């Protein structure tokens, strides 16, 4: 298909999502709830762009890049005023109740939420009220769990239920008191629970084995190897 | 140590007879446990999960999602007073103050003897008849703060 | 430093006989009081569980409302 | 009028209502022309013919959306292999100010049963579910007794009066969350899941409950359909000279002399209803504001009282009709507290799916609490208007948030002076460290 982003013509696939088509072109659209291997939901609204139908249009409509098909004839815009300030408002709503504990966090320089907060360009805080706190759970010797860092993007339960097939983790909660985990305290019996460290964009599900003797990502000397 | 009575199992199975998917009867199974025992304990989630076949995470999420599925232990009479806007205009702060002066508690907590549990409710659907409340599936309308002690003395 | 831990004293009277003993270890840097920032504590702002600091006991943090609670 | 004559020509719903507010059972329903439209549908009407009559009768949505049910029923697939279709009745409200279905199910259950019979034969559905609430107990008892009586009378079962159309009706009493009223979240809650809504355009008419084509309709829509099929279509177009055909259960509530519920044709203005049907308000009240729909629509001032309560007429006034159950606000009630309570209900009765509603309705709650307690700060009114601009349709996953922030829109637009007077202290988001010079911008 042929789409037009930022007043520029691009040739992307027809049956795929607009978010993955824009990310395949090297463009930058922030996202929290979409995963390439888990499909697309509307748990966040971070991938918002402004869509136009005709070649020339004034108002348009704020749509989600992970809910819009990359069809022939779409004229979407990314770095306009309204979509950028809406994405800044969404990251502001995510920092409305987020604990001030980044240097004592196992993600740190490996955190997607930091990257998408800096990418949207939000530094000034206008929230002056109290935050939201949760208790913790013991999820075995591998997955350290702490719920304060969460942004309710539903990627963990989506992976753990639809993809991994595990029957342990899930959503228990309400409007704002939404919880992601286990109804009791115990080890996650699924054999794929270790992918929650990279599935979660926040520091909720973290590597306990890496939490012991911990170092940051930039201090890590990496290598490509085989298990 | 939780177990399910025979009447609970018959009611739950008859409810799953009404639906294509046995998952659809989870809310009614939790409601049956609520009608028999007053609240949903921790073992009831696993009991409903084992009877229905769905995992315990989904049953826990259903129990913790809906407002009138109580997981904390409540009293023998759940007072559910309206917290919405029509009864706000008609006046629910007066009856809330009357309840707080009679039961000497706060909303969301139970009395020390386990006699009443005070709770706000989204709406009752009785907006035209003034302020409304429910005690033990019994509705009351056209309420006044003076009639609250008279209304509260007819419950065990 | 987000905790104002590492600081620069006005002390400059240094100089060692060996290059090996110019590497200051943990016991050579940690002093017994608050320095240029006297009344700041990071862990009163952090959200993690701390001895003497439960959840919701930090600054601008509400008490953790239970998921199973009766409040709608 | 104080005394209203309920002839069936102008009041097709409540003309058979009893004076003592007692439920009309099967014998009394059949005495007052009962199951005649159902008989016509199940004997001499094709399902496509019934769909066409509903489409051309001008019946629209009565749950607040205002979408025509004929075009809703036209979205069913034409494949005959998908014969596992479902019909759902949105008996759930939990909306402040919405109380018409309580009357419609407490004293007219057989009308709803006949409506589901007609709509299930029109949609070729084999199962119907009345999604009620746990708060409605007498209505559930009356509906179950009406279902039992209809099953005893040879209806609502297998081969209904010798047709071969098999239909079974069930009542599902929900535990209660306000988000369960929306059709996709009602479908999700019916499947025993958490009541999170679903994305569009995978429609419920193509893939709804358990992947099967479903149609979700309000109580009043299914109460208006059997009168259409029993009295005719031209009669239904010849009861009100307005673009919205049919009658609506209107009525005012909130410190009124006679807060009630009356069936009136469309195009009737709110002023005549308030002064004659509601009888005016009580002593010492000046009627400073009103809201057309119960708690989901936005406020209107006294200058908009002359507007006829239609869909399009209130649409161009920066508003919407909603459930057409009006709510009155007097000068004795501060709108800061009122809008704070509305936002509190919307914040604590939303779901936890999508970000903007999730983390903006509590923010609006806290800002309105600060304005109520006199601790308002510079940067709150513009924050609220940016919030309500960013919580419109399309920005959120479902339509709970636009209906949540519409009262914020009207309270900001009209009664701005109260919110401006709610701000006393200056801006204070950060406190000093007394070792670091602050970055005070001027
Ligand atoms: C948050 C929300 C709550 C709703 N609650 C109800 C309700 O309680 N009753 C209702 O009939 N429609 C409600 N609706 C509207 C439904 O989406 C839908 O219009 C209804 O189920 C059927 O519409 P109809 O009148 O065209 O048949 C609600 C919509 C939203 C967004
Ligand atoms: S715990 Fe992580 S993956 Fe799960 S919803 Fe929260 S931020 Fe998303
Ligand atoms: S998960 Fe939260 S606390 Fe941890 S680095 Fe990311 S933003 Fe900071
Ligand atoms: S707007 Fe979003 S969070 Fe709010 S009720 Fe709808 S889907 Fe749920
Ligand atoms: S990435 Fe599209 S809404 Fe979350
Ligand atoms: S607003 Fe109280 S009963 Fe509806």
mmCIF file with all atom_site columns, C-alpha atoms in Angstrom, chain B residues 14-28 30-31 34-35 52 54 57-69 80-93 120-130 132 134 136-142, chain D residues 84 86 93-99 102 126-127 129 133-137 144 170-180 188-196 209-210 212 253-255 259-261 282 291 295 327-329 333-334 337-338 340-342 344-345 348-352:
data_model
loop_
_atom_site.group_PDB
_atom_site.id
_atom_site.type_symbol
_atom_site.label_atom_id
_atom_site.label_alt_id
_atom_site.label_comp_id
_atom_site.label_asym_id
_atom_site.label_entity_id
_atom_site.label_seq_id
_atom_site.pdbx_PDB_ins_code
_atom_site.Cartn_x
_atom_site.Cartn_y
_atom_site.Cartn_z
_atom_site.occupancy
_atom_site.B_iso_or_equiv
_atom_site.pdbx_formal_charge
_atom_site.auth_seq_id
_atom_site.auth_comp_id
_atom_site.auth_asym_id
_atom_site.auth_atom_id
_atom_site.pdbx_PDB_model_num
ATOM 1   C CA . UNK B 1 14  ? -27.640 -25.453 36.531 1.00 0.00 ? 14  UNK B CA 1
ATOM 2   C CA . UNK B 1 15  ? -26.313 -21.964 35.758 1.00 0.00 ? 15  UNK B CA 1
ATOM 3   C CA . UNK B 1 16  ? -23.667 -23.406 33.413 1.00 0.00 ? 16  UNK B CA 1
ATOM 4   C CA . UNK B 1 17  ? -26.520 -25.307 31.746 1.00 0.00 ? 17  UNK B CA 1
ATOM 5   C CA . UNK B 1 18  ? -27.884 -21.916 30.605 1.00 0.00 ? 18  UNK B CA 1
ATOM 6   C CA . UNK B 1 19  ? -24.747 -20.755 28.750 1.00 0.00 ? 19  UNK B CA 1
ATOM 7   C CA . UNK B 1 20  ? -22.705 -21.954 25.788 1.00 0.00 ? 20  UNK B CA 1
ATOM 8   C CA . UNK B 1 21  ? -19.429 -21.385 27.663 1.00 0.00 ? 21  UNK B CA 1
ATOM 9   C CA . UNK B 1 22  ? -19.061 -22.412 31.334 1.00 0.00 ? 22  UNK B CA 1
ATOM 10  C CA . UNK B 1 23  ? -16.944 -19.268 31.873 1.00 0.00 ? 23  UNK B CA 1
ATOM 11  C CA . UNK B 1 24  ? -20.141 -17.190 31.557 1.00 0.00 ? 24  UNK B CA 1
ATOM 12  C CA . UNK B 1 25  ? -21.448 -18.526 34.898 1.00 0.00 ? 25  UNK B CA 1
ATOM 13  C CA . UNK B 1 26  ? -18.491 -17.266 36.975 1.00 0.00 ? 26  UNK B CA 1
ATOM 14  C CA . UNK B 1 27  ? -20.253 -14.074 38.092 1.00 0.00 ? 27  UNK B CA 1
ATOM 15  C CA . UNK B 1 28  ? -23.375 -16.019 39.077 1.00 0.00 ? 28  UNK B CA 1
ATOM 16  C CA . UNK B 1 30  ? -19.619 -15.828 42.901 1.00 0.00 ? 30  UNK B CA 1
ATOM 17  C CA . UNK B 1 31  ? -23.097 -14.400 43.529 1.00 0.00 ? 31  UNK B CA 1
ATOM 18  C CA . UNK B 1 34  ? -22.135 -14.463 48.274 1.00 0.00 ? 34  UNK B CA 1
ATOM 19  C CA . UNK B 1 35  ? -25.803 -15.290 48.911 1.00 0.00 ? 35  UNK B CA 1
ATOM 20  C CA . UNK B 1 52  ? -15.897 -24.262 36.039 1.00 0.00 ? 52  UNK B CA 1
ATOM 21  C CA . UNK B 1 54  ? -11.326 -21.617 33.946 1.00 0.00 ? 54  UNK B CA 1
ATOM 22  C CA . UNK B 1 57  ? -6.758  -15.708 37.840 1.00 0.00 ? 57  UNK B CA 1
ATOM 23  C CA . UNK B 1 58  ? -9.895  -15.026 35.784 1.00 0.00 ? 58  UNK B CA 1
ATOM 24  C CA . UNK B 1 59  ? -12.194 -15.796 38.730 1.00 0.00 ? 59  UNK B CA 1
ATOM 25  C CA . UNK B 1 60  ? -10.100 -13.537 40.979 1.00 0.00 ? 60  UNK B CA 1
ATOM 26  C CA . UNK B 1 61  ? -10.252 -10.748 38.398 1.00 0.00 ? 61  UNK B CA 1
ATOM 27  C CA . UNK B 1 62  ? -14.024 -11.101 38.057 1.00 0.00 ? 62  UNK B CA 1
ATOM 28  C CA . UNK B 1 63  ? -14.440 -11.080 41.851 1.00 0.00 ? 63  UNK B CA 1
ATOM 29  C CA . UNK B 1 64  ? -12.187 -8.025  42.244 1.00 0.00 ? 64  UNK B CA 1
ATOM 30  C CA . UNK B 1 65  ? -13.654 -6.138  39.261 1.00 0.00 ? 65  UNK B CA 1
ATOM 31  C CA . UNK B 1 66  ? -17.349 -5.883  40.141 1.00 0.00 ? 66  UNK B CA 1
ATOM 32  C CA . UNK B 1 67  ? -18.266 -3.722  43.120 1.00 0.00 ? 67  UNK B CA 1
ATOM 33  C CA . UNK B 1 68  ? -20.955 -5.949  44.664 1.00 0.00 ? 68  UNK B CA 1
ATOM 34  C CA . UNK B 1 69  ? -18.753 -9.035  44.988 1.00 0.00 ? 69  UNK B CA 1
ATOM 35  C CA . UNK B 1 80  ? -25.742 0.584   50.489 1.00 0.00 ? 80  UNK B CA 1
ATOM 36  C CA . UNK B 1 81  ? -26.437 4.319   50.385 1.00 0.00 ? 81  UNK B CA 1
ATOM 37  C CA . UNK B 1 82  ? -26.605 6.315   47.169 1.00 0.00 ? 82  UNK B CA 1
ATOM 38  C CA . UNK B 1 83  ? -23.529 8.376   46.284 1.00 0.00 ? 83  UNK B CA 1
ATOM 39  C CA . UNK B 1 84  ? -24.727 9.798   42.955 1.00 0.00 ? 84  UNK B CA 1
ATOM 40  C CA . UNK B 1 85  ? -25.877 13.244  41.868 1.00 0.00 ? 85  UNK B CA 1
ATOM 41  C CA . UNK B 1 86  ? -29.708 13.142  42.004 1.00 0.00 ? 86  UNK B CA 1
ATOM 42  C CA . UNK B 1 87  ? -29.640 12.003  45.628 1.00 0.00 ? 87  UNK B CA 1
ATOM 43  C CA . UNK B 1 88  ? -26.909 14.607  46.166 1.00 0.00 ? 88  UNK B CA 1
ATOM 44  C CA . UNK B 1 89  ? -29.364 17.302  45.063 1.00 0.00 ? 89  UNK B CA 1
ATOM 45  C CA . UNK B 1 90  ? -32.143 15.703  47.121 1.00 0.00 ? 90  UNK B CA 1
ATOM 46  C CA . UNK B 1 91  ? -29.637 15.397  49.976 1.00 0.00 ? 91  UNK B CA 1
ATOM 47  C CA . UNK B 1 92  ? -27.601 12.344  50.943 1.00 0.00 ? 92  UNK B CA 1
ATOM 48  C CA . UNK B 1 93  ? -25.015 14.083  53.140 1.00 0.00 ? 93  UNK B CA 1
ATOM 49  C CA . UNK B 1 120 ? -21.663 3.871   48.920 1.00 0.00 ? 120 UNK B CA 1
ATOM 50  C CA . UNK B 1 121 ? -23.350 2.712   45.729 1.00 0.00 ? 121 UNK B CA 1
ATOM 51  C CA . UNK B 1 122 ? -23.060 4.121   42.202 1.00 0.00 ? 122 UNK B CA 1
ATOM 52  C CA . UNK B 1 123 ? -26.825 4.336   41.655 1.00 0.00 ? 123 UNK B CA 1
ATOM 53  C CA . UNK B 1 124 ? -30.036 2.606   42.740 1.00 0.00 ? 124 UNK B CA 1
ATOM 54  C CA . UNK B 1 125 ? -32.324 3.401   39.806 1.00 0.00 ? 125 UNK B CA 1
ATOM 55  C CA . UNK B 1 126 ? -34.833 5.108   42.136 1.00 0.00 ? 126 UNK B CA 1
ATOM 56  C CA . UNK B 1 127 ? -33.844 8.686   41.380 1.00 0.00 ? 127 UNK B CA 1
ATOM 57  C CA . UNK B 1 128 ? -37.340 10.201  41.191 1.00 0.00 ? 128 UNK B CA 1
ATOM 58  C CA . UNK B 1 129 ? -38.263 9.074   44.729 1.00 0.00 ? 129 UNK B CA 1
ATOM 59  C CA . UNK B 1 130 ? -35.615 11.095  46.576 1.00 0.00 ? 130 UNK B CA 1
ATOM 60  C CA . UNK B 1 132 ? -32.480 5.863   48.321 1.00 0.00 ? 132 UNK B CA 1
ATOM 61  C CA . UNK B 1 134 ? -30.536 -0.757  50.128 1.00 0.00 ? 134 UNK B CA 1
ATOM 62  C CA . UNK B 1 136 ? -30.152 -6.730  52.565 1.00 0.00 ? 136 UNK B CA 1
ATOM 63  C CA . UNK B 1 137 ? -31.853 -6.471  49.151 1.00 0.00 ? 137 UNK B CA 1
ATOM 64  C CA . UNK B 1 138 ? -34.507 -4.144  50.621 1.00 0.00 ? 138 UNK B CA 1
ATOM 65  C CA . UNK B 1 139 ? -34.784 -0.697  49.059 1.00 0.00 ? 139 UNK B CA 1
ATOM 66  C CA . UNK B 1 140 ? -35.842 2.510   50.804 1.00 0.00 ? 140 UNK B CA 1
ATOM 67  C CA . UNK B 1 141 ? -36.772 5.873   49.285 1.00 0.00 ? 141 UNK B CA 1
ATOM 68  C CA . UNK B 1 142 ? -37.884 9.365   50.378 1.00 0.00 ? 142 UNK B CA 1
ATOM 69  C CA . UNK D 2 84  ? -26.382 -19.126 16.444 1.00 0.00 ? 84  UNK D CA 1
ATOM 70  C CA . UNK D 2 86  ? -28.005 -13.836 20.066 1.00 0.00 ? 86  UNK D CA 1
ATOM 71  C CA . UNK D 2 93  ? -28.446 1.151   33.875 1.00 0.00 ? 93  UNK D CA 1
ATOM 72  C CA . UNK D 2 94  ? -26.512 2.219   37.018 1.00 0.00 ? 94  UNK D CA 1
ATOM 73  C CA . UNK D 2 95  ? -26.763 5.750   35.605 1.00 0.00 ? 95  UNK D CA 1
ATOM 74  C CA . UNK D 2 96  ? -27.770 8.614   37.938 1.00 0.00 ? 96  UNK D CA 1
ATOM 75  C CA . UNK D 2 97  ? -31.134 9.892   36.733 1.00 0.00 ? 97  UNK D CA 1
ATOM 76  C CA . UNK D 2 98  ? -32.067 6.848   34.606 1.00 0.00 ? 98  UNK D CA 1
ATOM 77  C CA . UNK D 2 99  ? -35.074 5.050   36.098 1.00 0.00 ? 99  UNK D CA 1
ATOM 78  C CA . UNK D 2 102 ? -37.264 0.019   36.479 1.00 0.00 ? 102 UNK D CA 1
ATOM 79  C CA . UNK D 2 126 ? -32.253 -18.472 19.155 1.00 0.00 ? 126 UNK D CA 1
ATOM 80  C CA . UNK D 2 127 ? -31.206 -17.182 22.601 1.00 0.00 ? 127 UNK D CA 1
ATOM 81  C CA . UNK D 2 129 ? -30.456 -12.622 27.558 1.00 0.00 ? 129 UNK D CA 1
ATOM 82  C CA . UNK D 2 133 ? -28.542 -5.496  37.650 1.00 0.00 ? 133 UNK D CA 1
ATOM 83  C CA . UNK D 2 134 ? -28.272 -6.817  41.179 1.00 0.00 ? 134 UNK D CA 1
ATOM 84  C CA . UNK D 2 135 ? -29.996 -3.669  42.431 1.00 0.00 ? 135 UNK D CA 1
ATOM 85  C CA . UNK D 2 136 ? -33.174 -4.579  40.501 1.00 0.00 ? 136 UNK D CA 1
ATOM 86  C CA . UNK D 2 137 ? -34.713 -7.443  42.483 1.00 0.00 ? 137 UNK D CA 1
ATOM 87  C CA . UNK D 2 144 ? -38.773 -14.440 35.726 1.00 0.00 ? 144 UNK D CA 1
ATOM 88  C CA . UNK D 2 170 ? -32.775 -16.043 30.222 1.00 0.00 ? 170 UNK D CA 1
ATOM 89  C CA . UNK D 2 171 ? -32.186 -13.358 32.853 1.00 0.00 ? 171 UNK D CA 1
ATOM 90  C CA . UNK D 2 172 ? -28.589 -12.509 33.798 1.00 0.00 ? 172 UNK D CA 1
ATOM 91  C CA . UNK D 2 173 ? -28.373 -10.359 36.938 1.00 0.00 ? 173 UNK D CA 1
ATOM 92  C CA . UNK D 2 174 ? -25.031 -8.575  36.923 1.00 0.00 ? 174 UNK D CA 1
ATOM 93  C CA . UNK D 2 175 ? -23.088 -7.703  40.048 1.00 0.00 ? 175 UNK D CA 1
ATOM 94  C CA . UNK D 2 176 ? -22.850 -4.076  38.962 1.00 0.00 ? 176 UNK D CA 1
ATOM 95  C CA . UNK D 2 177 ? -20.359 -1.769  37.269 1.00 0.00 ? 177 UNK D CA 1
ATOM 96  C CA . UNK D 2 178 ? -21.456 1.254   35.238 1.00 0.00 ? 178 UNK D CA 1
ATOM 97  C CA . UNK D 2 179 ? -19.191 0.275   32.327 1.00 0.00 ? 179 UNK D CA 1
ATOM 98  C CA . UNK D 2 180 ? -21.292 -2.903  31.897 1.00 0.00 ? 180 UNK D CA 1
ATOM 99  C CA . UNK D 2 188 ? -17.640 -9.154  27.712 1.00 0.00 ? 188 UNK D CA 1
ATOM 100 C CA . UNK D 2 189 ? -19.397 -9.267  31.094 1.00 0.00 ? 189 UNK D CA 1
ATOM 101 C CA . UNK D 2 190 ? -21.951 -11.749 29.733 1.00 0.00 ? 190 UNK D CA 1
ATOM 102 C CA . UNK D 2 191 ? -19.107 -14.132 28.807 1.00 0.00 ? 191 UNK D CA 1
ATOM 103 C CA . UNK D 2 192 ? -17.950 -14.245 32.436 1.00 0.00 ? 192 UNK D CA 1
ATOM 104 C CA . UNK D 2 193 ? -14.978 -11.941 31.817 1.00 0.00 ? 193 UNK D CA 1
ATOM 105 C CA . UNK D 2 194 ? -14.072 -8.514  33.137 1.00 0.00 ? 194 UNK D CA 1
ATOM 106 C CA . UNK D 2 195 ? -16.319 -5.884  31.548 1.00 0.00 ? 195 UNK D CA 1
ATOM 107 C CA . UNK D 2 196 ? -13.765 -4.217  29.329 1.00 0.00 ? 196 UNK D CA 1
ATOM 108 C CA . UNK D 2 209 ? -20.868 -12.865 22.315 1.00 0.00 ? 209 UNK D CA 1
ATOM 109 C CA . UNK D 2 210 ? -18.725 -16.010 21.919 1.00 0.00 ? 210 UNK D CA 1
ATOM 110 C CA . UNK D 2 212 ? -21.506 -15.135 17.235 1.00 0.00 ? 212 UNK D CA 1
ATOM 111 C CA . UNK D 2 253 ? -35.837 15.007  38.616 1.00 0.00 ? 253 UNK D CA 1
ATOM 112 C CA . UNK D 2 254 ? -34.134 16.898  41.425 1.00 0.00 ? 254 UNK D CA 1
ATOM 113 C CA . UNK D 2 255 ? -35.895 19.207  43.913 1.00 0.00 ? 255 UNK D CA 1
ATOM 114 C CA . UNK D 2 259 ? -40.447 14.348  40.018 1.00 0.00 ? 259 UNK D CA 1
ATOM 115 C CA . UNK D 2 260 ? -41.817 11.500  37.936 1.00 0.00 ? 260 UNK D CA 1
ATOM 116 C CA . UNK D 2 261 ? -41.812 9.719   34.580 1.00 0.00 ? 261 UNK D CA 1
ATOM 117 C CA . UNK D 2 282 ? -40.596 23.754  45.052 1.00 0.00 ? 282 UNK D CA 1
ATOM 118 C CA . UNK D 2 291 ? -29.248 18.489  32.223 1.00 0.00 ? 291 UNK D CA 1
ATOM 119 C CA . UNK D 2 295 ? -25.583 12.444  34.484 1.00 0.00 ? 295 UNK D CA 1
ATOM 120 C CA . UNK D 2 327 ? -32.156 16.729  36.035 1.00 0.00 ? 327 UNK D CA 1
ATOM 121 C CA . UNK D 2 328 ? -32.550 20.181  37.591 1.00 0.00 ? 328 UNK D CA 1
ATOM 122 C CA . UNK D 2 329 ? -29.911 22.198  39.484 1.00 0.00 ? 329 UNK D CA 1
ATOM 123 C CA . UNK D 2 333 ? -26.447 23.734  45.094 1.00 0.00 ? 333 UNK D CA 1
ATOM 124 C CA . UNK D 2 334 ? -22.902 24.736  44.191 1.00 0.00 ? 334 UNK D CA 1
ATOM 125 C CA . UNK D 2 337 ? -19.645 19.950  44.597 1.00 0.00 ? 337 UNK D CA 1
ATOM 126 C CA . UNK D 2 338 ? -22.081 18.641  41.973 1.00 0.00 ? 338 UNK D CA 1
ATOM 127 C CA . UNK D 2 340 ? -17.069 16.845  41.803 1.00 0.00 ? 340 UNK D CA 1
ATOM 128 C CA . UNK D 2 341 ? -19.628 14.149  42.650 1.00 0.00 ? 341 UNK D CA 1
ATOM 129 C CA . UNK D 2 342 ? -20.247 13.460  38.948 1.00 0.00 ? 342 UNK D CA 1
ATOM 130 C CA . UNK D 2 344 ? -16.163 10.931  41.373 1.00 0.00 ? 344 UNK D CA 1
ATOM 131 C CA . UNK D 2 345 ? -18.872 8.588   40.070 1.00 0.00 ? 345 UNK D CA 1
ATOM 132 C CA . UNK D 2 348 ? -14.804 5.135   40.452 1.00 0.00 ? 348 UNK D CA 1
ATOM 133 C CA . UNK D 2 349 ? -17.165 3.505   37.921 1.00 0.00 ? 349 UNK D CA 1
ATOM 134 C CA . UNK D 2 350 ? -14.849 3.438   34.894 1.00 0.00 ? 350 UNK D CA 1
ATOM 135 C CA . UNK D 2 351 ? -12.778 0.425   33.944 1.00 0.00 ? 351 UNK D CA 1
ATOM 136 C CA . UNK D 2 352 ? -9.010  0.102   34.003 1.00 0.00 ? 352 UNK D CA 1
#
